Amino acid sequence: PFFPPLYLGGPEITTENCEREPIHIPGSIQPHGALLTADGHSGEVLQMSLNAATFLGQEPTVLRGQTLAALLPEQWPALQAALPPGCPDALQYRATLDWPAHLSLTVHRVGELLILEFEPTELRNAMFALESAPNLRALAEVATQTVRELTGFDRVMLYKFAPDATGEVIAEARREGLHAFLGHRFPASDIPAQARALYTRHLLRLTADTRAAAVPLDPVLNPQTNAPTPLGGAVLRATSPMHMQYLRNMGVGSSLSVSVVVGGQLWGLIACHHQTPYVLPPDLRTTLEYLGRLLSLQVQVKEAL
Amino acid sequence: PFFPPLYLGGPEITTENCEREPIHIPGSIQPHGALLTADGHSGEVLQMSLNAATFLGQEPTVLRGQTLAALLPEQWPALQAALPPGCPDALQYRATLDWPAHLSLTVHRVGELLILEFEPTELRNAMFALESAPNLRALAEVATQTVRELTGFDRVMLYKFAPDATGEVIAEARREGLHAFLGHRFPASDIPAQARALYTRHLLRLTADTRAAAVPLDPVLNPQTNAPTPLGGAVLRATSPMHMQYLRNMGVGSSLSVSVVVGGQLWGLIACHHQTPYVLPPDLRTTLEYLGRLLSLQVQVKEAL
Ligand SMILES: *C/C=C1/C(=C/c2[nH]c(/C=C3[NH+]=C(/C=C4\NC(=O)C(C=C)=C4C)C(C)=C\3CCC(=O)O)c(CCC(=O)O)c2C)NC(=O)[C@H]1C
Ligand SMILES: *C/C=C1/C(=C/c2[nH]c(/C=C3[NH+]=C(/C=C4\NC(=O)C(C=C)=C4C)C(C)=C\3CCC(=O)O)c(CCC(=O)O)c2C)NC(=O)[C@H]1C
């Protein structure tokens, strides 16, 4: 069972309790975007990332208590209609906002709360190539190469889970000069059980800068519930410090993975690294999510044979 | 063998490599004091903690290259005479400085380098009580109580090493309401082998604030050697982040220990905690060092019986 988060008196995580970190409720975000939460009926802004002024032009204490009707008059009606009470928490509303400089808006609903993520923003032959791979190994190779071409990441791996939850790099596409990880295996604890569970529900996550301090969300508890705000569905969620350290020690400045899900079970990850911090553009992330779903379908087919 | 320190490309320490942390050369200090290093012949200031202006009234780049003859005209001759080339690195010169507000100065020599520590500053019946204890347990109890009375620390333990380097609290004096650690045992890795080795040579160390960021020493390499500056003999040395985290998880804001050395081997520690950060005053530290040496002598006697 999860430890309380750090802002509810919980301990700092060590290797003795990797699996107890409540990674879904860090009460903080990554600094390359801003996050607000708002009441799902009134649109009242309830919580604000402390960097909100960087992206939204108003300080957290000024945004607090204003409504989405006032702040986002052109989106608020569409937002309400798209995300009614009781919809799945993976259902998203997306908009491109004009700002005096575009800003990508992504919204999802958890219970009675709307979670709004703001970040700056600017194939058919590839799909057929995945379809055309004659065996699992070839599929893995095509997938990693395709994703590397799409994203420009220094390394793209297909990381496969064994039944004991150990992991192995079974294919990779890599920049000239990087060491090989192909065939290397890793303990189950490197991607602990609560992360694997989260990754079965929320299919993409990332750390754009593995040295960047998390930006608090405040007030940290959702005022509706006096309880932590679920951020498993927010790509801007702060990453576990244990994993950030693993990445820094690996010389990785930016990391992103997409779940490969087969028969409702986490089969593996498309796992990406960059040496230098790097924000994969929002449109490239959406494409990569779609490729993950397509790869998932293809892996199910090839491994059966 | 030690990893390189973090400023020479070394990794961040994890539980897989506790013993490889080069804790003696962190290239940084605790913020409750200031540290300079100076050439042992010229007195030229070679390195400066980045907080030097807080204590010394001049910025690091202004202090750099000035001589101790200019900066400390009243102490420099005595300092030279007290710490000639080739003296033991545990030999100290101490002075009380008048400042516009006293400042404790502690100096030692390592090779051709003088290491100067600056921090703010403001029994016979007890010794006889240690002498008078009729057995090891009673000695342990008297020692912890005496140290607690001297220091005001919330907890004072006698932590004894077993031959396998596991540790046990064999006596303690504690504030009302604290849980007992008496009889609890701990793995050898909690005080890893390079720490135990350091603690056989340098008999007192502390962390005054277990949440305080370390203050860099710059330039970080000694310009004499283009190599790290040994800080094992400096009480202001930054503490291992692994240990700081252990203490925070324990609810300890301030920690200090004194080595108990029997037949040249590390027998145990007088180990002190405070819940709130706390700078044990310099004069109290000197007294506590002396009590450690006296306790060491007494333990040798009692355990033989
Ligand atoms: C005691 C806790 C530990 C720990 C926790 C942890 N790890 C993750 C997430 C990931 N770990 C990954 C591992 C690898 N990436 C690689 O490239 C390789 C080998 C080549 C390995 C073994 C990966 C891929 C992830 C997923 C996220 C990502 O793609 O960047 C989490 C969850 C992080 C989060 O979502 O907030 C946690 C809690 N990892 C350890 O090694 C120990 C120290
Ligand atoms: C993988 C590394 C780990 C680690 C490293 C570490 N620990 C120390 C120093 C100390 N540890 C102490 C342990 C205890 N204090 C207690 O009160 C109790 C139990 C009641 C224990 C087990 C102590 C007493 C010290 C000495 C310093 C002090 O008195 O505060 C070091 C060296 C620190 C330094 O001098 O810079 C290191 C590297 N400890 C772990 O638990 C693992 C994570």
Residue numbers in the entry:
A (entry chain A), B (entry chain A): 7 to 107, 110 to 130, 140 to 322
From the paper:
Phytochromes sense ambient light levels in plants, fungi, and bacteria. The proteins detect light and trigger intracellular signalling cascades, which regulate many light-dependent phenotypes. The PAS and GAF domains hold a tetrapyrrole bilin chromophore, represented by phytochromobilin, phycocyanobilin, or biliverdin in plants, cyanobacteria, or bacteria, respectively. Upon light absorption by the chromophore, a sequence of structural changes is initiated, which shuttles the protein from a red light-absorbing state (Pr) to a far-red light-absorbing state (Pfr) or vice versa.
The PAS-GAF fragment of the D. radiodurans phytochrome was crystallised in essentially the same conditions but the cryoprotectant 2-methyl-2, 4-pentanediol was added directly to the crystallisation buffer. Those changes resulted in the protein packing as monomers instead of dimers in contrast to previously published conditions. The space group C121 and cell dimensions were highly similar to the crystals from monomeric PAS-GAF21. We recorded diffraction data at cryogenic conditions at the European Synchrotron Radiation Facility (ESRF) and solved the structure to 1.35 Å resolution by molecular replacement with 4Q0H9 as a search model. We refer to this structure as “LowT”. The 1.35 Å resolution to which the LowT structure has been determined is the highest reported so far for a wild-type PAS-GAF fragment. We also note that the LowT data support a water molecule with partial occupancy close to Tyr263. The water is hydrogen-bonded to the A-ring carbonyl, the pyrrole water and the functionally important Asp207. The diffuse electron density in the LowT structure could be due to radiation damage or to alternate conformations of the chromophore-protein bond. Importantly, the LowT structure corroborates the SFX structures.
